[PDB]
Amino acid sequence: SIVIASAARTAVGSFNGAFANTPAHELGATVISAVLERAGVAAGEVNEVILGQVLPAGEGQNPARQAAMKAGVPQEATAWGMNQLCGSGLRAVALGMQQIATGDASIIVAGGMESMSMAPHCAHLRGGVKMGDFKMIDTMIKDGLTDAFYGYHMGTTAENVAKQWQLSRDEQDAFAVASQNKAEAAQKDGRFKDEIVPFIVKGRKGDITVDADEYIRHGATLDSMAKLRPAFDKEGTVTAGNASGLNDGAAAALLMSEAEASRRGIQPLGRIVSWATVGVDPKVMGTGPIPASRKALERAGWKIGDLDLVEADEAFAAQACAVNKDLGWDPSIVNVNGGAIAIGHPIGASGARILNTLLFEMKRRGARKGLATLCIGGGMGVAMCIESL
Amino acid sequence: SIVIASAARTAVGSFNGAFANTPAHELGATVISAVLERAGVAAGEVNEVILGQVLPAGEGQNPARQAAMKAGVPQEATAWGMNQLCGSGLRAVALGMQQIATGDASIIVAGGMESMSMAPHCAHLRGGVKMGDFKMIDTMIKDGLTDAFYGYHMGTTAENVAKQWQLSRDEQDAFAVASQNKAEAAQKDGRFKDEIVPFIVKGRKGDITVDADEYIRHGATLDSMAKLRPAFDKEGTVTAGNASGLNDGAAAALLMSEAEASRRGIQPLGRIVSWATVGVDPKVMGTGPIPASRKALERAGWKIGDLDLVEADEAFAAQACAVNKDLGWDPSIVNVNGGAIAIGHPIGASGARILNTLLFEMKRRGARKGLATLCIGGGMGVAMCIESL
Amino acid sequence: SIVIASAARTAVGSFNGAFANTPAHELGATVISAVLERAGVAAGEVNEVILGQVLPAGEGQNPARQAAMKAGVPQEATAWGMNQLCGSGLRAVALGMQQIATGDASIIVAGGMESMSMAPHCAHLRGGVKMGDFKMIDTMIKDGLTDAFYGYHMGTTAENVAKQWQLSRDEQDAFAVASQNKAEAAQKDGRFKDEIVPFIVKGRKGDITVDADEYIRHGATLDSMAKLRPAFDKEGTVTAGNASGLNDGAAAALLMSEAEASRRGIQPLGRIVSWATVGVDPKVMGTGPIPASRKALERAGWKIGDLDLVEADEAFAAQACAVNKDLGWDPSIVNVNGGAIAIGHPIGASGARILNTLLFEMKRRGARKGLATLCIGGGMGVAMCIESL
Amino acid sequence: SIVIASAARTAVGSFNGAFANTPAHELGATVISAVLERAGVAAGEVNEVILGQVLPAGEGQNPARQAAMKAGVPQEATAWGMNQLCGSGLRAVALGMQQIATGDASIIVAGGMESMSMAPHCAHLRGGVKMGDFKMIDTMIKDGLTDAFYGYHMGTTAENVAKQWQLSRDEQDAFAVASQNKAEAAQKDGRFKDEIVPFIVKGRKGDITVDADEYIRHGATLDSMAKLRPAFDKEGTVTAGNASGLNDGAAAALLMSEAEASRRGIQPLGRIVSWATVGVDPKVMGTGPIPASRKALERAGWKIGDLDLVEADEAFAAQACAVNKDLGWDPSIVNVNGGAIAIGHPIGASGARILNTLLFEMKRRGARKGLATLCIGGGMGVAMCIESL
Ligand SMILES: CC(C)(COP(=O)(O)OP(=O)(O)OC[C@H]1O[C@@H](n2cnc3c(N)ncnc32)[C@@H](O)[C@@H]1OP(=O)(O)O)[C@@H](O)C(=O)NCCC(=O)NCCS
Ligand SMILES: CC(C)(COP(=O)(O)OP(=O)(O)OC[C@H]1O[C@@H](n2cnc3c(N)ncnc32)[C@H](O)[C@@H]1OP(=O)(O)O)[C@@H](O)C(=O)NCCC(=O)NCCS
Ligand SMILES: CC(C)(COP(=O)(O)OP(=O)(O)OC[C@H]1O[C@@H](n2cnc3c(N)ncnc32)[C@H](O)[C@@H]1OP(=O)(O)O)[C@@H](O)C(=O)NCCC(=O)NCCS
Ligand SMILES: CC(C)(COP(=O)(O)OP(=O)(O)OC[C@H]1O[C@@H](n2cnc3c(N)ncnc32)[C@H](O)[C@@H]1OP(=O)(O)O)[C@@H](O)C(=O)NCCC(=O)NCCS
Ligand code: NA
Numbered sequence A, B, C, D: 001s002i003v004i005a006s007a008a009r010t011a012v013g014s015f016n017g018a019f020a021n022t023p024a025h026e027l028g029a030t031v032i033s034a035v036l037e038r039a040g041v042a043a044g045e046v047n048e049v050i051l052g053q054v055l056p057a058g059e060g061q062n063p064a065r066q067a068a069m070k071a072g073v074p075q076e077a078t079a080w081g082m083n084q085l086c087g088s089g090l091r092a093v094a095l096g097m098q099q100i101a102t103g104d105a106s107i108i109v110a111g112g113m114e115s116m117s118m119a120p121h122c123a124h125l126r127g128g129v130k131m132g133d134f135k136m137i138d139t140m141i142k143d144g145l146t147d148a149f150y151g152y153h154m155g156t157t158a159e160n161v162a163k164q165w166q167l168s169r170d171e172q173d174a175f176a177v178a179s180q181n182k183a184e185a186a187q188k189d190g191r192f193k194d195e196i197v198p199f200i201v202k203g204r205k206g207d208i209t210v211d212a213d214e215y216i217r218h219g220a221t222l223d224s225m226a227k228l229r230p231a232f233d234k235e236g237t238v239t240a241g242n243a244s245g246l247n248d249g250a251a252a253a254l255l256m257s258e259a260e261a262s263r264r265g266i267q268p269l270g271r272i273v274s275w276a277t278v279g280v281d282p283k284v285m286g287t288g289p290i291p292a293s294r295k296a297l298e299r300a301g302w303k304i305g306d307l308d309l310v311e312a313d314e315a316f317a318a319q320a321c322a323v324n325k326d327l328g329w330d331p332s333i334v335n336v337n338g339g340a341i342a343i344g345h346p347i348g349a350s351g352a353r354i355l356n357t358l359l360f361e362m363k364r365r366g367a368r369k370g371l372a373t374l375c376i377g378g379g380m381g382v383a384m385c386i387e388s389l
């Protein structure tokens, strides 16, 4: 039915890193033009662009639109943003598939973009503050990383799952390191060369080409890892190390019918066979990828053991472990090239980021059936099933 | 096969007025509660809440999930927000319709919520400001009213449609005057009591019930309309009087399959027969509703003259006059109870707001074929065809 | 040897009231002009302007110079501000006196100005904020009303005095009401007309003449007072009703030698016979006037009983009561016309505001010896002895 | 009559450099301690602390008092700040001397402290901002560096002086380069060691001792000077190179009578023989030292040629050259160890910084008669004559 023609992600940038001053939509256009070029499709053939983005504050009117226009998609087309937090990137892909499945469109670009780096501070000041201190709110912490129900960090939900699945400091540390290593290796074997399209951070003192994931640490040791203090709970288990970071990035996918691809002689990066989204308690939102991964497989008629390759987003070691334990798929096919503890977690783009890494790596090893899935703040999961053609 | 089982909107509040300190998700909760109540559907049956919102800055993670959970919908359902500017409110309905149409959901509550009063000022400060003055950006003007591409105000784009369509000052003045009068008469005659669910503004100094649109001005005269100076060009045509305002409000629909409604003995407000969205030159985004309104009538197999009732949004008098003039539908069926020039333009929820007025006026005057449409910054249109059952 | 040739003060304004948008130096300018007119001295003859000012953040370079220049004092003269908190207004007079005393100047305009309304919110942003919320600090509260040592509001220093001196809520309220009633009598009898110079608040739509203390309430009851909640301690004793207020205003004196005055045929308001400032524990800063008044009297060779009229500043009812109790002066010659609780308390100006009231009441009643004194945040007091010529 | 018993200044820090996070009063405290220790006088004997300070916004009530308490000056003593812009530090000493001269105090510690690095951005938000962008004002620029009357930067008055005196770019550069070279020589010869007191920047990450002027560049070349662009007028002559810096630091002197000094067996750095402050046109504010020095010399009974040593502050090469040409003093006795262009210019402390450099160099080379002088924004100059004992 619906296939992914092509895909691309920018490298994933460290917080205030290569993209410190690069507005999301600039990362997005690059990625739009990327899927386009790789597919042999002209921008004038794009009906719509759908982009997950949690933090567009201050970036001006509809950053999705801006990104599509800069990428050369004509004014005739349409563009919008959407927000299911860390699910946004993956969900945008599903919402775009559904544009084609309902016949409301023929060709969509979909994914996510996020500049956590560029997120402003804000305060409501219309009424006027008559007397006293007021807080300038970090929209990155407030609108993306803080649970609107208990008022604590996602980091706390992690701790929750930790004590609920009794995961030890070390057990999680072990997860992180393995991730860090798997990521470093993959990078060396050039396993990211394909999916990554380079971004030119144009300066005034000179242009800089970013085409490599700068968040991944080489020479990751469990022992400097073990030296870190917990980031949230004063006597907790979760650390800056066994948890993903704050990052800038973008990623997307050219969607069209399987029929359309044939006519254009395109070798699709895969076929979207199913998807699901499901909720759970906000206090353990990191469990979301479990009900979601099951409803998705259910809808596919796939058994947990049909999966050749999985991409379960590593929002946290504590929760990724929980996911892995509860569903119990073969960990050797889970995050073969390292997860987000190493690569980085650009909120609104993370879902499409892992989608790319799934698809290119599926191609790489000729795997038939893959899955990708992420946890979502507020208490949700999102998952998708892909099958090679 | 997809029907709007029910619908509800808040009264629309004036800028920094009755909802001055009411966050969007709260108006959204009251509205989600009501549609469930008016359809006789339990919160526990809601598969997903989809809410349009342009200005979430500062409101915390996924406000949609915030409205949903406050409305009683269980942690097991899902929620997300989307932004296609003034088109958001309607688009969400279209997206929700798709959820059930693809067989991914049974029951959605969709629409939007906007608090332009609560919108904060922001500034990007992570690098720090080494030296000199910097600007605190008003996210309402920046993310909602400012064209990303030409940098001027939506009002300036109206001036564009004004010059392109040669619409004089008195021409728009009269348009606004009628709007105001039709809004005042509709309010007095009680034609708004149906679609409005009362909102309780909890105040430390006592509670207040808001159930009336407070933006409508009683006794709008052509003369006082012509005493105003241009709001966007020293020697221009657009004024405060012939443009919509800045407003707060929320509005939703409850969709399910036509079969589902029959199983429940629910008499739907309408069936969604078609929808569309098109793009145009950002300079004249006001023209947006023309390609969209048409594309929607075509997808429906309807002639223009087939329409019994039309809701075509009045972002500005200039642009609405233009849309009416092109499509040439009988004006006396356009904005029968007045438009956003009087009632208000709560951006994110505006699309769902006109859909509300549409449905309840279609029911009371017994109209069969209806359509709402809105224009969208960055040059875009949205439209939906509805039909009673 | 040094006399006060003339005096003047603006009306004292309410917080965000009459002078809500008037910069301190504009208030300053008017007052400088007044003491000039009243003395028959030309702007051209001024040597220096000394103005106490606590909260000048954001007002531009050396506001004191801005005022002198706005008043047509020549560029060849000099101006500066100084800051001894609530003691600033009077201290500036002692400082002006010294200039002349040491032969370094002949004619000084001295006093204070304050717009607490105009005081801005600020934050150090150079280093930048990587992550998280920061506080926008209210400079008024931070730089004028909070103890830098103990972290608490001046009101809390007042509670400290109330406990040590065992002054009850009722003893305090009574003092406050008495202050209000005296001030109201004085205002109604016109006893403030001499000292006050009108100030014209320029405004787009209409200029407004402010020539009456607007913060003085009429017919205020012991009852309403007794019903107020403690403002600084949820189970304290100090309230908004028995503390001074937050206010805008300016006040000045024109200093010159007794001989210079005699050559000019000026009949001075008084002779500055001595002054003094002394420190005390910051925790009980309201006791400052006790030591300071004693030192000043001792310097002047006066017994407390020699005083005919006293202006003992009312920062707080608690401290005002403590001062009188320790000092023992006939309370019926203290704040004869009411004090800061009823009149207002523009910190940087307050010292000069009471000097104005002292001087003009001494004149009208034929009093020979007077004293003025204020308490000083952070643990200080200042006083000045005046003798009629 | 009045002598300077001892003196001390901190190393002068670079903008956001060594003291990027060090509040002025912390620098002030160290320097109060230093003068005490140096004179052999105990903290308990201090009567009053007078500290010039131009940018105290955000530091809290009366930083002067905070500095004094931190150095253990007793609570019974007093403290205040004052502001004559760049003249503050020197003016504070004249003020301090006056306290003693008029018999009101015996022991005074006076000078200035400034943390331009810690100066915050601010904005007046009490009235509320109904809509639209607003400025966060940099207090350092607004309250320290911008003329209040013409609205331009101090550097523009420097340009004005350049034209009037016809000072070429090359001649300004030569002056600046000479200054850098004189400072480098003194620093390496150890000529700044006597005046400097170490300051420990207390870092959680291990303490740091700051005891050298970090702003003084080594091996600077006339060639890189000459390439620099004009910083204020895009076709002017004044640049970052031939203009002074933005700096942090503090300086003070312990004051007491000659008789008192003798009774304690102290050998004073010098006798204050006279001082003066004079106004000039704000447009050429950099000319202040001309009439101020002349007034001081005259008051001292001295001819210009009587001077053995001079500290004429170097706000800008252009003004320094004007002053030297008008006064005619042998340039080889002016700023013998380099000036502000090379050392730094922390507004409020500058006046007392050059007092330090003057005093120790006078002691070092047995110079008998010296003079310090600085220009002041708003059109003023201050100067003081010193004589050895
Ligand atoms: C966890 C978190 C709070 C950490 O805060 P942080 O202090 O800014 O992170 P940092 O790594 O920069 O903190 C400092 C240190 O950790 C270190 N560190 C991180 N990973 C390490 C590793 N694997 N091995 C060794 N050291 C490591 C150092 O780099 C460092 O020392 P430094 O002082 O020289 O820089 C933050 O990154 C976060 O919020 N992550 C999760 C966000 C989220 O939940 N996204 C969506 C999911 S729902
Ligand atoms: C146009 C706009 C900027 C108006 O600015 P504004 O002047 O601050 O709004 P106001 O209502 O306070 O107008 C000011 C005055 O005109 C008046 N006025 C407005 N309509 C009037 C009428 N029909 N008859 C008589 N007076 C009228 C006011 O009551 C008012 O009186 P005052 O200024 O003397 O106090 C604002 O409403 C807006 O942004 N409109 C467009 C929004 C938009 O683009 N939405 C999305 C579209 S894609
Ligand atoms: C005391 C203080 C905290 C008050 O805060 P505030 O409540 O915002 O000021 P308000 O006057 O509006 O007090 C609030 C209420 O009490 C009332 N009230 C105050 N004084 C009253 C009186 N004398 N009689 C009857 N009612 C009175 C109000 O009118 C008001 O009613 P509302 O809130 O229902 O509308 C503030 O004014 C303050 O800081 N004063 C002194 C600070 C200081 O130390 N100055 C320098 C000297 S060291
Ligand atoms: C002039 C001023 C604006 C400096 O601007 P700035 O660019 O922010 O500060 P900088 O020192 O980093 O100057 C910029 C550059 O010129 C260089 N430069 C400065 N002085 C130099 C010198 N003496 N020799 C060679 N190069 C020099 C830099 O090192 C730098 O290079 P970069 O662009 O690669 O970073 C600031 O110092 C100021 O406002 N001075 C006036 C202070 C004042 O008026 N006091 C009160 C008077 S009464
Ligand atoms: Na103090």
Ligand code: NA
Residues within 6 Å of the ligand: D290, D291, D294
């Ligand atoms: Na001269």
